[PDB]
């Protein structure tokens, strides 16, 4: 018809928590961890050989 309708629905729309795909963060690569040492055992053994 042409009659207004009372809007009495108290909206409670709680948006769901969106998914998170946690990264595997890499701070120091293997090369840096191997190069962080002054004395490399492999090089010393190669020199001795």
């Amino acid at each position: 018809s042409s009659i207004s309708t009372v809007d009495s629905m108290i909206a409670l729309d709680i948006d769901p928590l969106e998914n998170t795909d946690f990264r595997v963060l890499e701070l120091y690569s293997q090369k840096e961890l191997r190069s962080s040492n002054v004395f490399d055992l492999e090089e010393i053994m190669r020199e001795f050989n």
């Binding site: 492999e42 053994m45 190669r46 001795f48 050989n49």
Partner: protein, 49 residues
């Protein structure tokens, strides 16, 4: 005084297995699986003669 010996030790190699290393520091640049017909798929860098 001349004495000949036969030492039996254990050698270790890591992937990609392009060199092994006995316990006495004998660093050998030969793949422990190079059988003489798969040089294309296994390293070999020691003296050829």
């Amino acid at each position: 005084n001349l004495n000949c010996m036969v030492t039996i030790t254990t050698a270790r190699s890591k992937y990609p297995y392009h060199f092994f290393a006995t316990s006495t520091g004998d660093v050998v640049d030969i793949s422990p699986f190079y059988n003489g017909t798969n040089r294309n798929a296994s390293y070999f860098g020691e003296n050829a003669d």
